Amino acid sequence: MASRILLNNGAKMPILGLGTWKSPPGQVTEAVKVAIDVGYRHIDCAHVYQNENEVGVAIQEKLREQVVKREELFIVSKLWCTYHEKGLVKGACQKTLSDLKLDYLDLYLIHWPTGFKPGKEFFPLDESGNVVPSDTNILDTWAAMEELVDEGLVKAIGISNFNHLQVEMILNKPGLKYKPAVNQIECHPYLTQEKLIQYCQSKGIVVTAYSPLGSPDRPWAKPEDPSLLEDPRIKAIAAKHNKTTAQVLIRFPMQRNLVVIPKSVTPERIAENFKVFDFELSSQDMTTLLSYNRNWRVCALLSCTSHKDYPFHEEF
Ligand SMILES: NC(=O)c1ccc[n+]([C@@H]2O[C@H](COP(=O)([O-])OP(=O)(O)OC[C@H]3O[C@@H](n4cnc5c(N)ncnc54)[C@H](OP(=O)(O)O)[C@@H]3O)[C@@H](O)[C@H]2O)c1
Ligand SMILES: COc1c(Br)c(Br)c(Br)c(Br)c1Cn1c(=O)ccn(CC(=O)O)c1=O
Numbered sequence: 488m489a490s491r492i493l494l495n496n497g498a499k500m501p502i503l504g505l506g507t508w509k510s511p512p513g514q515v516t517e518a519v520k521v522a523i524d525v526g527y528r529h530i531d532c533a534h535v536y537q538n539e540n541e542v543g544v545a546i547q548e549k550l551r552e553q554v555v556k557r558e559e560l561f562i563v564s565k566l567w568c569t570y571h572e573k574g575l576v577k578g579a580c581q582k583t584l585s586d587l588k589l590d591y592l593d594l595y596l597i598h599w600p601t602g603f604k605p606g607k608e609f610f611p612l613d614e615s616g617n618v619v620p621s622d623t624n625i626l627d628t629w630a631a632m633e634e635l636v637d638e639g640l641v642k643a644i645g646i647s648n649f650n651h652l653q654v655e656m657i658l659n660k661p662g663l664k665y666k667p668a669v670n671q672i673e674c675h676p677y678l679t680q681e682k683l684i685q686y687c688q689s690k691g692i693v694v695t696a697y698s699p700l701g702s703p704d705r706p707w708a709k710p711e712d713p714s715l716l717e718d719p720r721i722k723a724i725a726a727k728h729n730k731t732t733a734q735v736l737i738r739f740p741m742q743r744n745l746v747v748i749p750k751s752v753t754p755e756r757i758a759e760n761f762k763v764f765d766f767e768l769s770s771q772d773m774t775t776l777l778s779y780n781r782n783w784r785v786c787a788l789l790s791c792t793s794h795k796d797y798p799f800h801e802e803f
């Protein structure tokens with residue numbers, strides 16, 4: 488589709504972006520310098536990726552050589568769960584601004600619908616292994632997000648891993664100032680998200696799909712797990728197209744009006760990943776892909792299954 492989808496806030500947003508979860512501080516700068524070199528204009532970031540400083544370096548570097556202008560960059564960070572208490576949102580936002588070395592974000596997401604106990608510990612757990620919630624509610628958190636818009640710190644606000652009932656709850660929030668611009672969710676061939684994707688676009692909310700390649704590098708990957716990249720059925724469509732299994736996987740959600748944010752620190756792969764503004768997949772394959780759906784989640788936040796705002800109990 489069109490390279491820069493438009494958000495319900497006036498801004499357009501690059502449908503392909505560089506993902507930075509699991510990109511170690513020591514490698515992430517050179518990856519963001521490279522990805523910008525090849526053409527990426529969109530960076531997916533989070534405080535909880537513990538590399539924002541290093542990311543921010545690469546971004547400043549490119550501006551101060553005027554390889555790209557600020558207003559050309561679509562930069563996304565997220566508010567981690569330990570920061571939902573409304574009084575802490577602003578500070579968390581400023582901190583990530585300071586890390587990235589930016590005056591403003593193009594998009595700040597509520598990273599998960601679930602509030603954690605505030606601290607340094609990103610995932611605070613009781614003795615049984617479930618996280619320690621805060622009794623914060625979404626709407627209060629969301630309202631602090633809105634204040635960030637009005638204050639000029641962020642240009643848009645979205646949500647990530649929200650079920651539809653959770654988006655609905657914000658939409659129907661009395662006194663609502665801004666509807667969420669984006670829902671960032673897990674989306675890929677073994678989790679096609681047809682129902683929630685439908686719901687979100689219809690409400691005029693742009694859907695970014697995360698872990699498009701299945702996130703083989705996810706730390707808790709069992710060896711016996713399915714691998715998108717090494718699925719014979721998916722390898723074929725790629726050979727048929729004279730492109731890589733990954734390039735398929737990346738163009739797939741793009742042909743659904745989703746935004747997509749593959750992660751790499753491998754400069755070769757980073758650029759292999761951007762070589763997708765120049766072909767098309769057939770409706771034959773598109774529907775075949777959608778048929779592989781196993782309702783399989785890479786990110787299920789299982790330590791939070793007994794959190795009142797755990798989002799994955801809902802069908803969608
Ligand atoms: N909002 C949320 O809750 C949430 C959750 C998960 C992810 N996300 C976002 O989505 C981004 C992408 O998702 P992800 O990090 O889960 O995993 P992913 O993008 O599905 O896959 C990344 C893994 O695949 C490898 N890879 C990258 N390009 C490749 C290529 N062209 N060929 C073969 N292998 C390739 C990478 O290796 P190397 O890097 O070693 O090359 C890395 O190990 C994240 O980084 C994050 O920004 C958001
Ligand atoms: C639920 O909190 C934990 C816990 Br508990 C542990 Br242990 C780890 Br490791 C992570 Br990375 C997290 C946070 N987390 C996930 O669970 C799944 C994906 N991600 C990446 C993301 O949210 O973008 C997490 O940070």
